[PDB]
Amino acid sequence: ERMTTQDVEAITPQTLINIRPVVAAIKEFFGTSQLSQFMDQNNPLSGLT
DNA sequence: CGCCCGCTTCGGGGCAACCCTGCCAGTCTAATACAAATCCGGCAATGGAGTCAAGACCAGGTTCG
């Protein structure tokens, strides 16, 4: 999107790349997903299992 | 000639147990300019509401003649 609206001979990948949707996807995977489960450690066997 | 209807299939809504147990989800042209409304801060009319000091006032329980 901003590869066009930005003026040429002025921009740089510091001004192009937005890391905020990237970091949000990782944080919404490790938080609040039904595979990012809470570590069930009431003994070493269930910790392993 | 074009005209219409009986089975077939395609789709579409409804339902599929019950106790506990858990707890808070997203993104960009950017500012001026002005006016009505609102609000809040400070004296300034209070007079009402409370507070004290003083006393007058009884009429009854306590003591002397």
DSSP string, A12-39: -HHHH---HHHHHHHHHHHSS-TTS---
Shortest CA–C1' contact from A24: which nucleotide? B26
Instruction: Output DSSP code: residue A7.
Output: P
Instruction: Output DSSP code: residue A45.
Output: H
Shortest CA–C1' contact from A2: which nucleotide? B28
Please state how this structure was obtained.
cryo-EM
Query: CB closer than 7 A to strand B: which residues?
Result: A 18, 20-21, 24, 28, 32
Bases of chain B below 7 A from a protein C-beta are 25-28
Angle at A26 (CA atoms; ends A14, A32), nearest 5 degrees: 150
